[PDB]
Structure 1
């Protein structure tokens, strides 16, 4: 039908804009934040893909949890995530943020940021290489490309 075609084309336009102008917040916790800086380094240049590191959570689209998420830090991470205006995405970088990593059996480490915020992409490594994080972000762009938000609305 003509209705589905317009909605599908509109959905592609909306998805293309969101996935090609991802704005991660400047949020780094540990060793993995250093490799995150190397993704913004000239060699890999995350800004080349439109991925620009905004500072305030209210002006961001992705939260890249890069580092160990301690118990003392967990409430701060959740509130900063909640203050992100939707649509917002979470990318877990490093084994520390995935399932606790080296400090899984620690009295003051949350066993993965998944227990605090919903995660869209898990980037494995300790630390994941700057390409591995870039691969995860480019994988997130593909995941957003497969978002039929308006197309489902037309069929609700």
Structure 2
């Protein structure tokens, strides 16, 4: 589809937060996010990243990455099937296809 397997943080367009997010690991998540050159889209994959999943009530868990970054797509499942995630990506591409960046600019 065009989704290369591995891209460095500075060359990336979409972050995929696949897995749990413990408090200790939260600060580095944001630090990486802020370094993403725009436009930047965040995809939350799995139950532990949408809402803290199985470990929702644990003391050392962040209850969803949306507490730490603005998410664009939520892929549910523990874990989502590889095909379920692929649908999530193909969902984003349509979302990027409905933007009106120029039109909005043209009418300011």
How high is the TM-score relative to the length of structure 2? 0.98
Aligned residues: 108
CA drift of 1:56 comes to 1.7
Which structure: greater helix fraction? Answer: 1
Residue segments in structure 1 that go unaligned for 5+ positions in a row: 1-48
Q: Distance in 2 between matches of 1:114 and 1:54?
A: 23
Q: Deviations over 1:50-78 (max 9, x none)?
A: 00133321100000000001100000110
Q: Distance in 2 between matches of 1:99 and 1:134?
A: 20
Structure with max Cα Rg: 1
Q: Distance in 1 between matches of 2:7 and 2:35?
A: 13
The answer on 1:117 being equivalent to 2:69 is: yes
Q: Distance in 2 between matches of 1:84 and 1:53?
A: 17
Q: Distance in 2 between matches of 1:146 and 1:57?
A: 26
Check whether the contact 1:54–1:60 (CA below 8 A) recurs between aligned residues.
Answer: no
How high is the TM-score relative to the length of structure 1? 0.68
Which protein has greater RCO, CA pairs closer than 8 Å, 6+ apart?
1
Q: For residue 91 of structure 2, what is the aligned residue in structure 1?
A: 139
RMSD of the alignment, in Å?
A: 0.7
Q: For residue 149 of structure 1, what is the aligned residue in structure 2?
A: 101
In the TM superposition, structure 1's runs of 4+ consecutive aligned residues that sit over 2 Å from their partners are none
